Every structure is written in structure tokens, then in C-alpha cells.
Amino acid sequence: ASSPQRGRPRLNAARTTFVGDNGQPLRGPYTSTEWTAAAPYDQIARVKELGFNAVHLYAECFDPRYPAPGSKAPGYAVNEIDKIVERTRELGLYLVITIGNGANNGNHNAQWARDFWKFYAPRYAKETHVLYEIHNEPVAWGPPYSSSTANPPGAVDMEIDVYRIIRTYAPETPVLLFSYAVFGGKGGAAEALKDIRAFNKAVFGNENAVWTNEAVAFHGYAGWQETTIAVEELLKAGYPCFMTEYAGGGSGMGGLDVELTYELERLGVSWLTFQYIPPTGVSDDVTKPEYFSALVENSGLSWTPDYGNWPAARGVYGNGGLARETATWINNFLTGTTRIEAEDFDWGGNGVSYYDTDSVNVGGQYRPDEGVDIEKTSDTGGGYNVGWISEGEWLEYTIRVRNPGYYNLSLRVAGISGSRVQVSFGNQDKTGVWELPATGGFQTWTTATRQVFLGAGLQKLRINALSGGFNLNWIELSPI
Ligand SMILES: [Ca+2]
Ligand code: NA
Ligand code: NA
Ligand code: NA
Ligand code: NA
């Protein structure tokens, strides 16, 4: 069809999340019409060149005082929300509409929420690119909302009541439930399942209903590790989910949480990050590199975007396509391999994941159709080495450092005089100029070692050749 409007998102076959009309996850930043005009078309359009296909809208913020005299009633921002709906329609973006909280996160006004959805559910029912998220962070700070000691109580009743209102007027619109601020651990999943069972009993007549057009909205404020565990457990229990707010700072500040993004990508979960579309928002501008694009580029995170060519296509070679996790010490032993073969640089291409001065692999070995020059090695263990290493060349390897601290970085090298490298981690220099040992021959091998101090997380290891005159067999990174 010729309309730019996206088709309704649907649950994927795996029932892990909502995917769009090309099968791909929804990925996006946010904006707000809670006390401002709709973000301009030209600014919303920028999301498409940042790898996104979706926008989170905090449409209006609730008034705890409603319906008392002077209180702000739902519907006040209709003219601006209509513009966001129109602009995303035209731009070929998905839109997740919710109720925001202002200074009152971890709280809600049930009557206000019911009245908001009575007004807006019918209004955007037929807008196929639009999803409804019942209410942002309605309880301080996570499950079980169904507990009598939840702060405030009764949010599951609001979820039920609002779901019925939505489905009355918008029978086919995806609904995102709960919007838990802090969703962590096996415990968090078990507590959420209490809420889910209560909801299901009330609206479907069965605690164990199989949702066809609903998912659990959750946030990342338990931290990436604990959130990943809770998500994994909920997916195992058969309930799809959708990340709707997170950042790498309980803080919405600090930019993209690269670690949690990586896990969500692995698990097949759509996500909305807490960085904003210009001109304004409460946290950090998603178009500022330091809060999003540079975090992606430094880490090696990649996904196939609906629009444009960013992030560039790339990934790990070998290791099941997973970032190469660094070993740790447990009970006086190393938990896994410390060695990365040099010929296992990330795929992506010349100028992307490596740079080689000859477009052809002049060695012909191992990866003949990429540009790094590779030969069979005569070193112990056999296999392959990178050879014909020229000044200015570089090789990247996406790794994941489990623990921050000191590591021994070793390079297995062979060569003549005057060889030097410099090694970056997440585009930060960790070695300075490193004068490598001469061995007297291109197949006479030695191990050069230098201590580095690393931060945790997904990060690219980049070897920059500051000279020629050496071959490289492998890299080791070993915790001290
Ligand atoms: Ca070369
Ligand atoms: Na707030
Ligand atoms: Na080459
Ligand atoms: Na040397
Ligand atoms: Na090798």
C-alpha cells in the first residue's frame, strides 16, 4: 500500500513481544505533550536516522486532585496529541501512548485514568500505528500491585477497569499493562504473576489466559542484571513483554543502558529508551551522541534498522554471534576462555569492523571474501594468523567485560624491528603507544603483555597498527 502508516504491531510467533509490520521489534525514544507543544515533524523525523521505528508519548500527566475544583481534566492536550499521532503516521513510525506522572511517579488517580481512556481509546482506535500503555509507573515501585499494602492500593482494579474501557472502544489496539518501575529478579517475576493472574481472572475468566494482543510493560530501574532475570522468567511463564522506559544511570539520567539493550535484543523484547526528541524533555536528548549514538558505536551494539543505515551492520565472528565474555576468577580457576583468535575480528566490512589497505585478503585463508590478510600460522597450536599488517590498519572485536578492573592484555606476535600498536576499548585508549618485541622472523612467535584498566560492559576491543612489520596470532585478556 502507498500510505506511510504502519500496520498494527502483533505478538511475534515466539510470544516474547510486539513486533511491527516487517516482523522487527519496536525501538524508540520518547516525547511528551504533558505541558508542551507536540515536538516538530522535522525533529521526530530524526529518530529514523538513529535506527528507531517507534516513539513513546507521555501524552498527559494525571492530576492527583481530580475531579476537585481547579483540577486538570484528561483531554487537555488533545490538539498536541493529535499532531503526534499525525506526524508519526506520516513518518512511518509506531507510537506508544501513555499517561505520565509529573512529580507524582509511583502513583495514579484511578478516576482520571478511566476518564482519559474513555476519551482517547475511541479517538485513536483505528490508528494502526498506535499502541496504548495504560499508565506509567502507577505504584511505588513494582509488583505486586495486588497486595493490600501496595502504594497506592488498587492499581490492578484500575488496570482491569481501563482494559475494559479500551477494549470497548478499541477492540484491536495493542495494550501494554502495569508499566512496572522496578522489575527485578525471580521474585519480581513471581510477584508480577500474582498481578497477571488477578487481571486475567477478572477480564478473561481464567487466571492462565493466553494473551493475543497484550504485553507487560516494564521499566529498567531494577538494573540490567535483575531486570534481565525477571524478563526471562516472565517469558518462560508465557507472557510477552515490552520495555517502555530505562536509562543507564533508579535514575532516568545517563543515556542508553547498553547492557540492558543487549539483553533485550537477545531475548526478543521491544524497547523504548528514556532519551527525548528535541526540543525538550525531562532527561537527556537522544540526538546528543554522548547519550545514545556514541554509546552504541563504542559498544558494538547493532540491530537492523527500519530506516537508514545506522547502526551499521556488524557483529561477532564465531562464538555463536554473542559478544565474547571476559573470564573471571571463581574458586581459584578461570571461568572460561581468555583467548580471541586474531582472525575472528567482527564482521561488518572494510572501514566498519576492520580496515585493510588491500581490499582482497592477500593470504587467501579462513575468510577469503573479506579484506583482512590471513595465512596459516606455524606457531604452536596451528590455525591462522593475521599477516601483511600495514600502518593505519585496525581490527575490532566485540567483547563484554564482566567486572571492571585490571586485566593482563596479551598479544601473540611475530616480526621484525619497529613494530608498534595501540589498543582501545570502547574507543578509549588503554595502552598508549605499545612497542612490540622483535622476534627476528615473521613465524617466530612471542607473547607481549601489558596491564590495562577496563570498565564493565559491552565494548569493542580495537587494535590499531601504528606500524607494519608484525603478524598477530591471537589476543588474550585475563583478569588479574
Ligand atoms: Ca593488511
Ligand atoms: Na516524575
Ligand atoms: Na587485504
Ligand atoms: Na620492537
Ligand atoms: Na590465530
Q: Are residues 151 and 214 in the same domain?
A: yes
Q: Ligand 2: distance of its center to the CA of 32 in Å?
A: 13
Looking at the fold, whether 122 and 201 belong to one and the same domain comes out as yes
At residue 40, what is the residue type? P
Question: Helix 185-204 to helix 224-236 angle, to the nearest 10 degrees?
Answer: 40
**Euclidean distance between CA atoms 471 and 363, whole angstroms:** 12
Show the cell assigned to 193.
Answer: 504473576
343 is in an annotated binding site: yes
70 found inside a domain: yes
Is residue 345 domain-shared with residue 296, that is, in the same domain?
no
**Is 408:393 a contact under the CB 8 Å cutoff?**
no
What letter does residue 319 receive in the DSSP assignment? G
CA of 474 to the centre of ligand 5 (A): 5
**How far does residue 413's CA lie from ligand 1's centre (Å)?**
15
First to last CA, the chain: 59
Give the distance (Å) from ligand 5 centre to CA of residue 473: 4
Please report whether residue 86 resides in a domain: yes
Is 322 a domain residue?
Answer: no
Query: What DSSP character marks residue 165?
Result: H
Residues 145 and 288 in one domain: yes
The helix/strand count (H/E) of the chain reads as 8, 26
Q: Which ligand is nearest to the CA of 439?
A: 4
384 annotated ligand binder: yes
- Which residues make up the environment of ion ligand 2, defined by Cβ < 5 Å? 105
Q: In terms of residue numbers, what domain contains 400?
A: 336-480
**Size of the chain in residues:** 480
C-alpha 390 to ligand 3 mean position (Å) = 10
Ligand-binding site membership of 371 (annotated):
yes
Cβ atoms within 10 A of the Cβ of 258, count?
22
CA of 343 to the centre of ligand 5 (A): 6
The enclosing domain of 404 has a CATH number of 2.60.120.260
The answer to whether position 320 is within a domain reads no
- Is residue 323 situated within a structural domain? no
Number of domains in the chain: 2
Whether residue 401 sits in one domain with residue 442: yes
Is residue 55 assigned to a domain?
yes
304 and 352: one domain? no
Taking the centre of ligand 4 as the mean of its atom positions, its distance from the CA of residue 470, in whole angstroms, is 10
Q: Which of 295, 311, 327 is the last residue of a domain?
A: 311
Same domain, 2 and 121: yes
In 282-362, which ranges are E strands? 284-285, 324-325, 329-330, 333-334, 339-341, 354-355
374 Cα to the center of ligand 1, angstroms: 8
Element (H, E) at 462: strand 457-465
Which run of H or E residues covers position 474? strand 470-479
CA distances (Å), 480 to each of 123, 332, 350, 460, in order?
60, 12, 34, 20
- The answer to whether residue 140 sits within a structural domain is yes
Other Cβ atoms less than 10 A from the Cβ of 365: the count is 16
Ligand with smallest separation from the Cα of 467: 4
Indicate which CATH number applies to the domain containing 106.
3.20.20.80
What's the half-sphere exposure (Cβ side, CA atoms, 13 Å) at 3? 11
Whole-angstrom Cα distance, residue 94 to residue 26?
A: 7
Q: How far away, in angstroms, is 474 Cα from ligand 4 center? A: 18
Distance CA 20, CA 28 (A): 13
**What technique determined this structure?**
X-ray
Ligand minimally distant from the alpha carbon of residue 104: 2
Residue 393 among known ligand-binding residues: yes
Domain contains 330? no
**What's the 367 CA to ligand 3 centre distance in angstroms?**
11
**What is the stated resolution of the deposited model, in angstroms?**
1.5
- Pair (45, 159) in one structural domain: yes
Q: 244 vs 114, 256, 300, 454, 469, CA distance in Å? A: 21, 13, 23, 30, 51
Residues 195 and 340 in one domain: no
User: Which amino acid is residue 137, in one-letter code?
Assistant: E
